[PDB]
From Swiss-Prot, chain A:
It is an enzyme of class 5 (isomerase). It comes from Pseudomonas fluorescens. Homodimer. The active site is at residue 45. GO terms for molecular function: trans-2,3-dihydro-3-hydroxy-anthranilate isomerase activity. NCBIfam families: PhzF_family. This is Trans-2,3-dihydro-3-hydroxyanthranilate isomerase. It holds the Pfam family PhzC-PhzF. One of its GO terms (cellular component) is cytoplasm. Isomerase that catalyzes the condensation of two molecules of trans-2,3-dihydro-3-hydroxyanthranilic acid (DHHA) into the phenazine ring system. The final product is not yet known. InterPro entries: Phenazine_PhzF-like. The keyword NADP does not apply. It catalyses: (5S,6S)-6-amino-5-hydroxycyclohexa-1,3-diene-1-carboxyate = (1R,6S)-6-amino-5-oxocyclohex-2-ene-1-carboxylate. Its EC number is 5.3.3.17.
Swiss-Prot record, chain B:
The keyword Isomerase applies. SUPFAM superfamilies: Diaminopimelate epimerase-like. One of its GO terms (biological process) is phenazine biosynthetic process. It comes from the Bacteria. This is Trans-2,3-dihydro-3-hydroxyanthranilate isomerase. NCBIfam families: PhzF_family. It comes from Pseudomonas fluorescens. Keywords: Antibiotic biosynthesis, Isomerase, Virulence. InterPro entries: Phenazine_PhzF-like (IPR003719).
Amino acid sequence: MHNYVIIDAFASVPLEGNPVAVFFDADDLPPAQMQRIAREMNLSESTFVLKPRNGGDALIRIFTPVNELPFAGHPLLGTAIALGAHTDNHRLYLETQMGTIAFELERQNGSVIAASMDQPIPTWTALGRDAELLKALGISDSTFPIEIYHNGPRHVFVGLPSIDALSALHPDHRALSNFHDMAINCFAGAGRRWRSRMFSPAYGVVEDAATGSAAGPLAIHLARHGQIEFGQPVEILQGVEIGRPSLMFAKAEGRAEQLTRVEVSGNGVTFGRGTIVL
Amino acid sequence: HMHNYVIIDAFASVPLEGNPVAVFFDADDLPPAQMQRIAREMNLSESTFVLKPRNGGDALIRIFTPVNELPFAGHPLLGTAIALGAHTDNHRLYLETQMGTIAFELERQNGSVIAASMDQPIPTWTALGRDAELLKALGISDSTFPIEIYHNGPRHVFVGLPSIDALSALHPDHRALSNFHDMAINCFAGAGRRWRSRMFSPAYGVVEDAATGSAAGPLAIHLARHGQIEFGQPVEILQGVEIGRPSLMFAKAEGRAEQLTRVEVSGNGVTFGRGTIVL
Ligand SMILES: N[C@H]1C(C(=O)O)=CC=C[C@@H]1O
Ligand SMILES: N[C@H]1C(C(=O)O)=CC=C[C@@H]1O
């Protein structure tokens, strides 16, 4: 029998942010059963905490309802906040398939409130499928070049001219299903405050509330396209239209040709706790 | 304020099959607005909330999809009945809903509720009258039977497919289907005592549902009306196969078209998990 906790990631109160189900003592579960359990929970991801293999504190496997991911932001944020309760550490090192991700935990009186990760440095290139994507989204143009970033998963970015235009999107999910192993992140905003919406049939979700692995790349994206400065922290608010407002903090340090750090951070809170029969 | 819940996999005898429902106990202190939010947090096709009775039943149940409330629904109530059945020795349970009181018979094995049967509301029906639009949304040219919509609280449209291969091949346009409000699109194929179903409902906040319990009753009526089975003949409807959530619903509609005396839907259910929430 496995205990799990539900964490609302990128939120300071239950019912906001993006839920993840974090399953403890999962070494006995085969990955095919992990996948099935994630299908059962039907949250954007469920995670599994395994004994470490390469010097971290744990090894974390990450599953959408339909696939395994080698890295994801909300799921690992939630896992780090839940795991934080086990110990007194303020530094946590979580192994994933993309490598070991360092976390700084924000604690008060030993109690975990928030966490900050150092993400893998993404690479990027032009999508090369603009007409198709914009048709799918129901729009004419992107405000900035449409590029796709890889840090484990992949994330494509499409800019909108206003927050109203971003909220007005009604994408064709079936057309979006032609975009494999990627999530589509639409953004709008100004200066240090940006809004996002994410759509990914490839990762099993019509619309996700907080796509944590997209936040760092967006910050890169905005700085490469002159809208913010490298090293300038931004707030990205996602999930508003679906009732799941999620605040992601991101900061990309260095320069386009040589990034040195991609930090994403947020609050998380416990929604519930229980146990599954297998 | 804290609430205990159980996750029941409805219309399955083993965990990880069937259709999950999250059942929250002692839920009277949650306003409907918060119940809707909790149902979104769980993100299951439905969550239910167990309230004290007002009309002589055992409990009053409110039912929520990720995006709306429903006056009745079959997998959520089945799972609710199995869950509440653990707390009682009784053979029958009466669950008040907005559609009236639904009677259940509980089946035990050893000291354990393993299944239940309900008597569903008798539906009304008519044609949908929008065949061309719906068929284009589904990605096909027609139905094997007249496209009709049944109402037993929620609404269910039925589109017949000529084979199981044809049914598994559907890749509907979710957005185009969102233009059909307040209903679920149930696509079926099969023969005799054995049918496959797939359900799609942007209106009820699900791309594809695993086991649409309130559709099982109407489908047996629909098949009897259209001469593919006889009234009163039990059928097995297997739903959710293509999404990896095989679910087995048993349905029997007794009487005749002009006068149905019982629409019975039953199935197995199993506990997958349980827990507590912080509000
Ligand atoms: N939660 C998202 C995720 C993330 O980084 O949090 C990556 C890809 C898809 C998921 O829905
Ligand atoms: N499970 C379904 C339901 C039912 O009767 O189980 C009714 C309407 C939509 C839900 O996804």
